[PDB]
């Protein structure tokens, strides 16, 4: 069941922004959003694709464990954090595209396509460069589809090993305190209009889990922090977090 | 190699307290403490024993997974947080002794003894009530021994399944942000003098891990927050965290 709560638009308007936030109460099995249409609108996943990419890479042995070092290829790139060695944990934390482009090439398009079908991931279309299709290729997914995918991951019900799903959920760790735990992943699609930013994941509470998926128009990189800020304002409004 | 930093005693004295803080730089394989003598002094583990107890219960199947509900036994206790259903995550978070006492009874004395010897855990002496020996029994462990045990857990080198060690490290999650992750467990020994408080765990950074183990005299519960405060205060002085 899905209910539309348009009052969340205040958080977008007050931040000179436009987008969608989708929430899912696991205990009640009930979803909420401010925009039904945009919640089901299909976008490029961008770096949110690092979640399924990690799962496949781990299960195929392309990645041994979360501490296997992937050496810098020496090429200086704009993002200074990319110009260094990384493991799975830091590669996720800093959204290091080049490391995951190497994962995709070793996975290959054949295994990438077939294993993404097992996840029921978006339109299941990887047409484009095997190492950039989630950035300028044919793959598309909606916020509600992110939720469905994330719920399977949380419950270890994706068709990969439990170990791989545990490692990725560890690598998704973003914030934790005495009130909640957030496991999530940011995204930032810029190669194909409209430019947008993602934040998908869930909030773990003592007695419930709140899955979330949001995307918003991102004409400039100045507003990237609004992906998390607007989400936390919805969470606060619903008394999910203090 | 071990170096003594007596300047950290300022953090204990200024709080009208006495104790030890032990740190271990994993990358450099170097330990630091304010009191070499007390760093090797053995105490009752108290609720810090919930770490090995969780490992044993998981590995033996006493606990299915981290979300298996353990129903309240109906008995009202002083700590209100104990008077409710718990899973492994919340049982750790709120140090629910009674839930872990039932684990110990189901593990049994023979399997408990064998597993602690495999862990090289303290003096490996479980004499006393099988469901309270870590509170008023014969088992003893020092701050340096806590580190050594925790390092095995971090590296999945303990003699249990990798899954068991991953679940417990998940259950140990205490704090996480863009700067560090803390996985730890508090302790509070009161049944046998001297009353003390524990905090054992480690700090995960991008490029290093800092294991820590601290205990301090705890004549009254007024100073339980000093377990984390004094630890985070040494970490601050040593430029480990902001
Ligand atoms: Cl975790």
Question: What are the boundaries of each domain within chain B?
Answer: 1-242
Spell out the residues 6+ positions from residue A193 whose beta carbon is closer than 8 angstroms to its own. none
Give the pair of three-digit tokens for residue A102.
């190497």
Which residue from B215, B187, B209 is spatially nearest to B35, judged by alpha carbons? B215
Which residues in chain B have their CB less than 8 angstroms from residue A167's CB? 166
Query: From the list A90, A177, A206, which residue is nearest B90 (CB)?
Result: A206
Backbone φ, ψ for residue B42 (5° rounding): -95, 135
Q: Do A177 and B175 touch (CB under 8 A)?
A: yes
Strands of A120-230, DSSP E = 173-176, 181-189, 196-204, 209-217
Q: Where are the alpha helices (DSSP H) in chain B?
A: 9-13, 36-39, 50-59, 88-93, 97-107, 109-119, 133-136, 143-154, 162-171, 226-237
Chain B interface mutation, best of A67, A69, A207, highest count of B Cβ atoms under 10 Å: A207
Tell me which residues of chain A have a C-beta less than 8 Å from any C-beta of chain B. 90, 93, 162-163, 166-167, 170, 173-178, 181, 204, 206
Q: Out of B7, B17, B47, B95, which one is annotated catalytic?
A: B47
The DSSP 8-state label assigned to residue A195 in this structure reads: P
Cβ proximity of B17 and B217 under 8 Å: yes
CB atoms within 10 A of CB B75: 8
| Residue B181 C-beta-side C-alpha neighbours within 13 Å | 25
Q: What share of chain B is helix, strand, coil (3-state, %, to 5)?
A: 40, 20, 40
Q: Are A138 and A125 in contact (CB under 8 A)?
A: yes
Please give the distance of CA B13 from its chain centroid, rounded to a whole number. Answer: 24
Residue of A93, A166, A181 lying closest to B173 (CB–CB): A181
Report the chain A residue with the minimal C-alpha distance to residue B164: A163
CA-based nearest distance B138→chain A, Å: 32
Please report how many Cα atoms fall inside a 13 Å half-sphere around the Cα of residue B75, on the Cβ side.
7
**How far apart are the C-alpha atoms of A99 and A103, rounded to whole Å?**
7
Between chains, do B173 and A177 touch, taking CB under 8 Å as contact? no
Residue B172 · residue B201 · CB < 8 Å: yes
Annotated active-site residue in A17, A47, A142, A189: A47
Query: How far is residue B97's CA from residue B134's CA, in Å, rounded to a whole number?
Result: 11
The minimum CA-CA distance between B173 and chain A, rounded to whole Å, is 8
CA–CA separation, A112 and A182 (whole Å): 28
Does B95 qualify as catalytic in the annotation?
Answer: no
Alpha-carbon gap: A20 to the closest alpha carbon of chain B (Å): 25
* CB-nearest partner of B175 from A90, A167, A176: A176
Cα distances (angstroms) measured from residue B111 to each of A7, B51, B53, B165: 57, 16, 11, 17
A170 neighbourhood in chain B, CB within 8 Å: 166, 170
Q: What DSSP element (H or E) covers B172?
A: none
Q: Which fold has domain B1-242?
A: Beta-lactamase (3.40.710)
The approach used to solve this structure was X-ray
What distances in angstroms separate CA A42 from CA A1, A139, B201, one per listed residue?
Answer: 20, 9, 43
Packing angle of the helix pair B143-154, B50-59 (nearest 10 deg)? 40
Beta carbons within 10 angstroms of residue B179's beta carbon = 11
CA dihedral for A212, A216, A220, A226, sign (positive or negative): negative
B200: β partners: B185, B213
Contact A174 B173 (CB under 8 A): no
Q: Do A173 and B174 touch (CB under 8 A)?
A: no
Resolution (A): 2.1
Answer whether A93 sits within 8 Å of B206, measured CB to CB.
Answer: yes
Q: Give B74 Cα–ligand 1 centroid separation in angstroms.
A: 31
The 3-state secondary structure of A8-40, one letter per residue? HHHHHHCCCCCEEEEEEECCCCEEEECCHHHHC
């Amino acid at each position: 069941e899905w209910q539309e709560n348009k009052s969340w638009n205040a958080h977008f308007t007050e931040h000179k922004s436009q987008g969608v936030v989708v929430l899912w109460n696991e205990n009640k099995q009930q979803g909420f959003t401010n925009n039904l249409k945009r919640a089901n609108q299909a976008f490029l996943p961008a770096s949110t694709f690092k979640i399924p990419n990690s799962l496949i890479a781990l299960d195929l042995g392309v990645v041994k464990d979360e501490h296997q070092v992937f050496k810098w290829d020496g090429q200086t790139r704009d993002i200074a954090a990319w110009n260094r060695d990384h493991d799975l944990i830091t590669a996720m934390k800093y959204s290091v595209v080049p490391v995951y482009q190497e994962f995709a090439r070793q996975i290959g398009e054949a295994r990438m396509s077939k294993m993404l079908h097992a996840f029921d991931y978006g339109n299941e279309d990887i047409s484009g460069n095997v190492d950039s299709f989630w950035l300028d290729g044919g793959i598309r997914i909606s916020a509600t589809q992110q939720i469905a995918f994330l719920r399977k991951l949380y419950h270890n019900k994706l068709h990969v090993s439990e170990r791989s799903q545990r490692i990725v959920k560890q690598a998704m760790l973003t914030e934790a305190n005495g009130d909640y735990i957030i496991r999530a992943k940011t995204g930032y699609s810029t190669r194909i209009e409209p430019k947008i930013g993602w934040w998908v994941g869930w909030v773990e509470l003592d007695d419930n889990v709140w899955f979330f998926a949001m995307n918003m128009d991102m004409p400039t990189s100045d507003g990237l922090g609004l992906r998390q800020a607007i989400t936390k304002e919805v969470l606060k409004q619903e008394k999910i977090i203090p």
